[PDB]
């Protein structure tokens, strides 16, 4: 559907599946996986060369074409902040006779550049904050779309318009060059980039059509982690509350309950960056109740304490609208429920999930949703179950502020702190 290049994984390779049959040469330094993600590193053979079908390039003067892809750009090093902010490097290039387009990164900025044969140049970029307690962009998969017509170059992020440059002063742009995927410029040996679903269209895509591609390419039967990667069974995870972004869970001292604490922040002295620590709190693990965690699966939410796997329970007969959850050894007990069904109540794209307690894998009764609540101690916030959430999650549009919304944070080389 107006698609002229469609890079996709196949047989430990990336191949153009557009139907136009371009040649794609992936060199040995490119890391691949069957989830369609590919990784560009600093090494020289870490590259992809694409040789276009010379019959279906973009129009050099009307400039009617679009580029879409997902990207995951690692966090800055706390001690490489000035190189991060200042070094620009190219990630993807399509140039012939010093004309064409390129995609560049400069720290927290992603840049689109057009160059006409006359040598005239125009750019448009997207930039994200590097001071946020919790950023939705740093080290997390997000969707980029660049569109061009004769007058404007635009960047959409996650289906929404972010930037807009007039490109009227741009004349003829040569269209038929090889597309080169490669980090190019002054970069660190540890600098890398993840990408997926790279596509080129011979049309200016509309926001409506882009917002749809974002939804379609966001959809999966499985859940995702904080970074946007698949959520897995048998993997250690930190827990994030999308309703309480700055809070984390700690097992209360010598007590089988989860207290909620405030995340520690970047405390060094640089005035360019700020963040909250992500690698803190209890370390959890998802177990099946009988690979990838799928919506509606039945699970156990466990965690590690005293070199042992403990479990998260709810008291069967709690009276109030909410109650503290019981965090305790794995045990048979008729006073507690252990069965959780994992949910995604949001209809829009998200990395949040919800955790519903039930009697078993057959029952239709719903006990409550795992969340956060302030308890009478002076008050104190605890890790809780709640039936209050059960009606709130019915509300449209989905309420993002509900503390029943969780994300799972595994360690990742793109996030150091």
């Amino acid at each position: 559907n107006n698609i002229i290049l469609n890079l996709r994984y196949k047989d430990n390779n990336l191949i153009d599946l557009s139907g136009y049959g371009a040649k794609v040469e992936v060199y040995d330094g490119v890391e691949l996986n069957d989830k369609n993600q590919f990784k560009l590193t600093s090494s020289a053979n870490s590259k992809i060369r694409v040789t276009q079908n010379q019959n279906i390039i973009f129009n050099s003067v009307f400039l009617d074409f679009s580029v879409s892809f997902w990207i995951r750009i690692p966090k800055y090093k706390n001690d490489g902040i000035q190189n991060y902010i200042h070094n620009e490097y190219t990630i993807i290039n399509c140039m012939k006779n010093n004309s064409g387009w390129k995609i560049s990164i400069r720290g927290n900025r992603i840049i689109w550049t057009l160059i006409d044969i006359n040598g005239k140049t125009k750019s448009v970029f997207f930039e994200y904050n590097i001071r946020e307690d919790i950023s939705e962009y740093i080290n997390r998969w997000f969707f980029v779309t660049i569109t061009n017509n004769l007058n404007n170059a635009k960047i959409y992020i996650n289906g929404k318009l972010e930037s807009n440059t007039d490109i009227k002063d741009i004349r003829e742009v040569i269209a038929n060059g090889e597309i080169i995927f490669k980090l190019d410029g002054d970069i660190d040996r540890t600098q890398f980039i993840w990408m997926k679903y790279f596509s080129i269209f011979n049309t200016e895509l509309s926001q409506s059509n882009i917002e749809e591609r974002y939804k379609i390419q966001s959809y999966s039967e499985y859940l995702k982690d904080f970074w946007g990667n698949p959520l897995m069974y048998n993997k250690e995870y930190y827990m994030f509350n999308a309703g309480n972004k700055n809070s984390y869970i700690k097992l209360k001292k010598d007590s089988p309950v989860g207290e909620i604490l405030t995340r520690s922040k970047y405390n060094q002295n640089s005035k360019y960056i700020n963040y909250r620590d992500l690698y803190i709190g209890e370390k959890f693990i998802i177990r099946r109740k009988s690979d990838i965690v799928r919506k509606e699966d039945y699970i156990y939410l466990d965690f590690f304490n005293l070199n042992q796997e403990w479990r998260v329970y709810t008291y069967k007969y709690f009276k109030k609208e909410e109650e503290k959850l019981f965090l305790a050894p794995i045990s048979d007990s008729d006073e507690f429920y252990n069965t959780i069904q994992i949910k995604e109540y949001d209809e829009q794209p998200t990395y949040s999930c919800q955790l519903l307690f039930k009697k078993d894998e057959e029952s239709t009764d719903e006990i409550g949703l795992i969340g956060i609540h302030r308890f009478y101690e002076e008050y104190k916030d605890y890790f809780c179950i709640s039936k209050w959430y059960l009606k709130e999650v019915k509300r449209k549009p989905y309420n993002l502020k509900l503390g029943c919304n969780w994300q799972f944070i595994p360690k990742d080389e793109g996030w150091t702190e």
């Binding site: 709690f318 109650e323 503290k324």
Partner: peptide
Amino acid sequence: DMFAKLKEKFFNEIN
């Protein structure tokens, strides 16, 4: 039996 001590604490906590 250590578990029982934990359960007892839990019931303190919610009462």
